[PDB]
Each structure stands twice: as C-alpha cells, then as structure tokens.
Design a protein around this ligand. Structure first.
Ligand SMILES: CC(=O)C1=NN(c2cc(C)ccc2F)C[C@@]1(CCCN1CCN(C(C)=O)CC1)c1ccccc1
Ligand SMILES: Nc1ncnc2c1ncn2C1O[C@H](COP(=O)(O)OP(=O)(O)O)[C@@H](O)[C@H]1O
Ligand SMILES: [Mg+2]
Length: 330
C-alpha cells in the first residue's frame, strides 16, 4: 500500500571540482538504484533496490510534482487525507524537495520558479484548480515542528519560539491528539502564500539560533487544509474535507531523536505485523499515526547522495525506504 520513491541528488561543485565519482546508479526505467559497495567502475560488488519510482539527478522540481504530488492532490480534493514524508541523511535534498529554493538574482517569481519544491507549487495549485471551476472553498495551513520531543509553531507571529506547545490525546476520537495553541493560518487568495512562507523562514531562523543543529535535528509537519463546498452543474453542495501532510523528517543520519527512533520502530512493528505498535512513544508517531497503518494515504521520498563517503548512510537509507514498502494503510 505505502508507496516509496527514491530521489537522487547530484554532485555539488565540491565533488565536481574534486573530480570525484558516484557509486549510485538511479535508473527510472527499471525503477531501481544500484550501489557500489566494494570498488572499481571495472570489477565491483554492488547492492540493488527497487521501489515504486526513481528520479535521477537530471530530475527537476516539476518532474517530482506531476509524478508524485498531483495524484495525492486530486485525492486530497475528494476529501481524502494524504501524507508525504521526506527521509534521509542530512545534505541529501530532503528539504530542497519539500520546500525548494529560490532562483537567484531575482530571475522569476514565486509562481514560476523552476526551483520551488512541493509545499509552494502545491498551494499555487490548490487555488489554481478549485478557483477555476465553479467551486466554493477555504484553506488553512499550519506548521508543527518537533525539537527534542518539544512542539513548535513556526507560523504563529504573536509569540516567539521558546514557547513550546502542549500535546494531549483527543477524547473525542481515540488515537488523535490535541495541539494546545497550534496556529492555523487561513489562505484567502493565491497571493497570500508567499508572505506566509517568508514568515516561517524567519521564525525558523530564530529557532536555529535557539537550539543546536536545529535544521538537521528537527521535524516539520506542514499541513494544508481544504474545506470544500463544491457545486457541480447541478445544485448539490459538496462538503469535502482534505488534509495533506508534508513532513520534513530529521537527518536520518545517526544526541538522540526519540521520534526518529520511534518511527523506525513504528515501521518495523507494522511490517513484522507485530500485534503492538509503539505509536505513543514519541510525538511524531502520535501526532502522525493514521499515516502509519491508518486510513491516510502515505508516500515516502527517500533521499541519497552519490558521494562515496556517504556509502554507509546511503545503504542504510535505501534499506530503510525499501522495507517501508510493506506497510499497508488506507
Ligand atoms: C519564503 C521563501 O522564499 C520560501 N519559503 N519556503 C517555505 C518556508 C517555510 C517556513 C515552509 C515551507 C516552505 F516551502 C519555500 C521558499 C524557499 C525558502 C528558503 N529555505 C531554504 C533556503 N534556506 C537555507 C538554505 O537556510 C532558508 C529556507 C520558496 C517559496 C516559493 C517559491 C520558491 C521557494
Ligand atoms: N536534486 C537537487 N538539485 C540541486 N541541489 C540539490 C538537490 N538535492 C539537494 N540539493 C542541494 O544540496 C544541498 C542539500 O540540500 P538540502 O535540501 O538542505 O538537504 P537536507 O535538508 O536533506 O539536509 C542544497 O544546496 C541543495 O541545493
Ligand atoms: Mg535542511
């Protein structure tokens, strides 16, 4: 059920100039990645994995979108729920993919930057779709961020960041959680998107100065909520509701990440079909359980680097992703 893709990044002008070599071969047609574990572009011992989709370095933000995002949007617009994880070592592109960057010198705008990753393109699309058709709606987005099993609202501009939120189970629906004081911004028009991000980009930063190796050590749950009151060429008023989750996991690389640690356990639990799954042992898991064996449709984007210094983490990441395939939610 759970679909996993492997996105492979390309050489930075560090491994470019240093005339270095890759050890990763990402083939989109056979849908697999083959790692060189021993040595020699001549005689070598390799390691090969297959997943649901593979994108080489030659891939562009736009290619990742129509291929993995579009469906999950259409679904999410039927009232469904969807989740997207990004997973992997630090420095491999988990963020680039999820957020993207900005094309330099000011070439383009935020609605045409070939560099903009998921979260951006997505918002510009939710509007660019329901707006078009005789559809009535409203959307909201929030950003839960985890640092040391401490919750953080990266958008709320009324209070700083030392202020950690509080988690309680929802007595309403079992397995749910209540996030005391979480902010849910309301995006009225496609022209609000950009500042909303420019905002968190700040607040993040103060967080980066507040606690150590924040970026590498945190989990950002970016959530966009669509309230739909559709109305086809009939007169019926749909009441669809969709929640699409975009998770930028912490550095897969190995103080201690209780959540990162609870996730691996959570998975293994579901794959070995172990009667008891340790959701409740970390915030992420509780906060995000329905995705791990629940009703939500989830997909993982594992990220890797060709550098031969990263062999041990690459294999580790590709083994992780490859096993996360047998989980079956929905
Ligand atoms: C405000 C802004 O420009 C941008 N904000 N982004 C963004 C910000 C937050 C909270 C959450 C989710 C997001 F998606 C994405 C980014 C790019 C953000 C830049 N990132 C990576 C670059 N940074 C680094 C390397 O430290 C700062 C944060 C963007 C937006 C539209 C089009 C292209 C790129
Ligand atoms: N497919 C890619 N193309 C270009 N740069 C990439 C790609 N993937 C990752 N990068 C990058 O190399 C660096 C690592 O990216 P980042 O997205 O912050 O990784 P992470 O968040 O996993 O630690 C950034 O400069 C970004 O430009
Ligand atoms: Mg990052």
């Amino acid at each position: 059920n759970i679909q996993v893709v492997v996105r492979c990044r390309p050489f930075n002008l560090a491994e470019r100039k240093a005339s270095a070599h890759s050890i990763v071969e990402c083939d989109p047609v056979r849908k697999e990645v083959s790692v060189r574990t021993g040595g020699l572009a001549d005689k070598s011992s390799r390691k090969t994995y297959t997943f649901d989709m593979v994108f080489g370095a030659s891939t562009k933000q736009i290619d990742v979108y129509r291929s993995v995002v579009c469906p999950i949007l259409d679904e999410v617009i039927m009232g469904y729920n969807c989740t997207i994880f990004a997973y992997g070592q630090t420095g491999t592109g988990k963020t680039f993919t999820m957020e993207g960057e900005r094309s330099p010198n000011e070439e383009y705008t935020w609605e045409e930057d070939p560099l903009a990753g998921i979260i951006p393109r997505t918002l510009h699309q939710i509007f660019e779709k329901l707006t078009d058709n005789g559809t009535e709606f409203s959307v909201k987005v929030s950003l839960l961020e985890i640092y040391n099993e401490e919750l953080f609202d990266l958008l709320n501009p009324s209070s700083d960041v030392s202020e950690r939120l509080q988690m309680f189970d929802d007595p309403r629906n079992k397995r749910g959680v209540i996030i005391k004081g979480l902010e849910e911004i309301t995006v009225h028009n496609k022209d609000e998107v950009y500042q909303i991000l420019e905002k968190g980009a700040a607040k993040r930063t103060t967080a980066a100065t507040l606690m150590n190796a924040y970026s590498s050590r945190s989990h950002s749950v970016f959530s966009v909520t669509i309230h739909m009151k559709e109305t086809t060429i009939d007169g019926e008023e749909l009441v669809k509701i969709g929640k699409l989750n975009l998770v930028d996991l912490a550095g897969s690389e190995n103080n201690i990440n209780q959540s990162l640690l609870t996730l691996g356990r959570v998975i293994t639990a579901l794959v070995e079909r172990t009667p008891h799954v340790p959701y409740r042992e970390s915030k992420l898991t509780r906060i995000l359980q329905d995705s791990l064996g629940g009703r939500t449709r989830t997909s993982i984007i594992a990220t890797i680097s060709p550098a031969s210094l990263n062999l041990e983490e690459t294999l580790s990441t590709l083994e992780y992703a490859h096993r996360a395939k047998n989980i079956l939610n929905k």
